[PDB]
């Protein structure tokens with residue numbers, strides 16, 4: 074509350090650490106379904122069903138232009154990529170499996186870093 078704060082956490086390295094995690098995400102061999110926005114003109118149903126599309130290149134642009142006020146907002150967009158993937162793809166599919174793998178890969182790097 075007012076004039077009552079927890080000991081101040083060093084958040085000066087968060088931006089660079091999130092960039093590092095995103096670079097690791099972008100270079101994983103199963104990152105290919107998430108590198109660029111899903112093409113809404115070429116994929117029927119996607120624009121209608123997925124209300125908040127998200128991909129690694131949009132995340133990179135947002136991170137690089139100061140559009141993440143904190144750690145949590147970055148993690149929400151990364152998780153949104155995989156929540157969208159689960160909504161539109163069968164678990165038993167290459168993209169469906171790519172999503173589950175990339176999520177597990179992200180969550181470990183996220184716990185280990187922060």
Ligand SMILES: CNC(=O)c1ccccc1OC1CCOCC1
Nearest residue numbers: 105106107111116158161162168
């Ligand atoms: C994350 N991608 C999808 O949920 C997706 C769903 C149906 C059809 C195509 C899709 O993504 C393409 C992205 C570019 O590479 C090939 C798949």
